[model samples]
Target: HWGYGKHNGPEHWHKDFPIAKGERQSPVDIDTHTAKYDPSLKPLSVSYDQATSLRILNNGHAFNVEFDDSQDKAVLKGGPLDGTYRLIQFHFHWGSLDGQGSEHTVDKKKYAAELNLVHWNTKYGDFGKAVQQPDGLAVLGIFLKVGSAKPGLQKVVDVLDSIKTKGKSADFTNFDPRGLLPESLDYWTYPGSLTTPPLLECVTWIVLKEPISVSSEQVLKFRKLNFNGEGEPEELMVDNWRPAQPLKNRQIKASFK
Candidate 1:
């Protein structure tokens, strides 16, 4: 009754796990059309590295990859972003069914899924404390679409078999997340809140204008995991994405330079 089915979707998920309410949600609608053009908040440079200490955690709602601070570092600069923010953890949101895997949508058009690269300001002690400040969190929003194939995401999808079960994760030491980035880092920035509950209003979001493509097969593989017990033999959780919320008069800036 609690596995992937019609009644046990994300809407009913919080019942068994009350803590899910506070979890940071993703895959929201991003209206690029209404988005104002502001050249101040552009990313200076988006860099990824072959992380040495990569650990995957099945944190109930999603699979989050935490990088050992000593190994991973992706920097962002330019426009409103003047300093470099380090990549801390990367996670994703999907729908319980297919054709609805993305977190961010564009003008009511939902994508397949969204990848969040959570970063923090080095001025703060750590990512934990940094999240308390308005400029502490820098989340890069990468929209996913069904297409021929996406080579950038092969590394992550290839290891899906290892963590197919809940609370089960293998040592993905040889995998480098940098390979998952698009060729262009041009992005749209804005001050937004965490998509999940306790929606902290302290995040600086960088959403890429261009979407990265992934094969239909790869997309199906991601929806096959169960958030509950391991080896539960659950149906595919295809639509794991969250619906978009109101902007609440917040100004969304873009980088054109």
Candidate 2:
């Protein structure tokens, strides 16, 4: 019902997904000046079980690293959260060109790409039920800056070739996503929605302030993925980012001042 093509990009998402214009749309520009520094915020904690790592797939919209969320094999807690958040999937949003992707922006500046690690709040029993509540999900946003090549990303990029086409997927396991985070746990928190439809307003965004570095070469591999499968005109997958929505009355809380 939605896509990133010029004809059906973010500008037109609200037509089908009514929540696209709802009060809690995601990918907002985080102006640190407007953020409230909370000394009471707890340090964030993430734990992942490599054995639960399943296959990775190109879901047409983007490539996703789906995991076994049935049990608490991977979970995120603390950092303004009061309950357990079990990791369901992690995915990327990038641009066709360098220096222009990433869904969330800081001070109006963009990054080469963005990685979203989505978790469902387990306090509500199942993810399906959690997604309908305001505190249903907690998504960790890690910005991808293009510079020195990152060794941590090599494990993820190595599998790109096999999942190159839309609907294509391959065996990808024993890979822990924690190494992909940057050196710092400092981040900004706000209430927002999924960048895609049904654009549910259930995510509590935890965006790290420090960006992880990737090489220019590594960034190119992202553009190599296709939005379409074989036997169709190849559509290069890129610019899969949602523009920042209005701040409205939302307050952004920073773990560090």
TM-scores, all candidates, are 0.82, 0.97
Q: Per-residue CA lDDT of candidate 1, range 1-257, in tens?
A: 44334686546656765634542333345566767777445445666654454777665567778776642355554546545677777888776454676767777776777888887777776877777787887788888888878776777777777777678886766557776677777777777756654456557888887878888888777877666657575644455455565565566666753
lDDT of 2 by residue, 1-257 (tens): 57899898889998888888888889899998989999999999988744277989999889999898888888999998988999998999998877789999999999999999999999898889989999999999999989899987888888999988988989888887877989889999999999998899999999999999999999899899998986789999999899999989899999998
Worst ten-residue run, lDDT, model 2?
A: 46-55
The C-alpha RMSD of each candidate to the native structure, in angstroms, is 3.9, 1.1
Candidate 1 displacement at residue 162 in angstroms: 2.1
How does residue 165 of candidate 2 score in lDDT?
Answer: 90
Worst 10 residues of 1 by lDDT: 19-28
Residue 133 local lDDT, model 1: 80
